Each structure stands twice: as structure tokens, then as C-alpha cells.
């Protein structure tokens, strides 16, 4: 049907120490999640068997690893990890923000 997401209207949910998120929007094929990292918070390297993922950097910076290759990403930069692609991140500045986008939707995050 269609929805709006008003950021101010939604709390941060705890993912783990130094990491918070908010589910932004989704359909069965497409999901956006806003993720907030303290400086030095770590997204452990991992792979998705069934989901594609793009991380778009909105604030702060991240060192992102894609299958061993590292790149420093600052606001406006992005990575894409097709499914079966190892990726991980380390946040380099306070309140680093990345938009994780997925296809299909990540039902495990509800």
C-alpha cells in the first residue's frame, strides 16, 4: 500500500553494545534499516546466503571489508555485497550512520 517513515517518531533499538538500529521501511522484496555505530563498534564479518545488501554511508565513516578488500567509506560512499559475499565494518567516528538495504526483506529483523 505505501507508508512514510518519520525518523524523529521512532526510537533506536539496541542491537548490541555500541550498535543501534531503526527499521525504516520494507516490502517483501526490499528493506531499509538505519544503523548507528559508536566509534570503534564492529560489524563482524559475515555473509548472507539469500540476501543482497548495500550499505550507504550517511554520517561518520567506516572501514568496510568485502571479501578481504578494505575501503574507507565516508558519507555518500557505499558498498554492495551480493549474497554469498563476506562483508564487515568498523566504525571510525562517533555516531557513524549507515543505511543497510536488503533484497529480499530480512524477516529475522522483523
Amino acid at each position: 500500500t505505501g507508508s512514510f517513515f518519520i525518523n524523529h517518531e521512532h526510537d533506536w533499538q539496541d542491537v548490541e553494545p555500541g550498535i543501534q538500529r531503526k527499521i525504516v521501511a520494507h516490502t517483501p522484496d526490499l528493506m531499509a534499516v538505519c544503523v548507528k555505530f559508536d566509534r570503534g563498534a564492529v560489524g563482524t564479518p559475515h555473509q548472507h546466503e539469500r540476501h543482497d545488501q548495500i550499505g550507504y554511508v550517511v554520517q561518520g565513516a567506516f572501514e568496510v571489508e568485502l571479501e578481504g578488500e578494505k575501503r574507507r567509506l565516508s558519507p555518500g560512499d557505499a558498498f554492495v555485497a551480493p549474497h554469498h559475499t563476506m562483508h564487515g565494518a568498523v566504525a571510525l567516528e562517533p555516531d557513524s550512520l549507515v543505511i543497510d538495504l536488503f533484497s529480499p526483506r530480512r524477516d529475522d529483523m522483523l
Copy 2:
């Protein structure tokens, strides 16, 4: 996997008042950064085959979703499943929205 470094890519003209950069894509997922001049209009339209999310990162837009209007600023978003009418009017110079699609929009390449 692939990286997109914004400083390495030029803006591409879409139409008057509108430029973009294709950020990243797989066959099932695509991100596009779209820049609007103030008062530039994305005329209302539907996609037969693509779900769309617009995530606002700079400036402000009035977004129309099946006749409902909201003013969206940085951090706000809309979701338009396929067959949902949506359009936008940019409210500020250099207003930026990340349009997200599934599957990818091959017509943009």
C-alpha cells in the same frame, strides 16, 4: 562485491533540475543518489515491476504517496510497493534522496 566512492563519480543529467549517480546494484537491488534543484518535480508515476524506497539525506521534499502528501527531511523516508503512485517536489537547493529499488532498474543501466 563492489565499492562506490562518491568523489570518484560525476553527476549525470536526468532532466532539467535533476541529476543522479548510480550508486550500486545487483540484479535484485539498486541504490541511486538523486539530486534535485529547489522546486524540481518528480511527476507522479507507478512502477509495474519495482518496489521503491526513497530515503532523504539532504534538503527536503514534499512526497506524494497515492494522494497522501508529507514533508520529508534528512532521515525520513517513503516506501512505494510496485503499483503505488508516488511523486515529489524538492523544497531546497541540492535536496538529495537515495532511491532504492528491487529488482534493479535496468532502464537506468
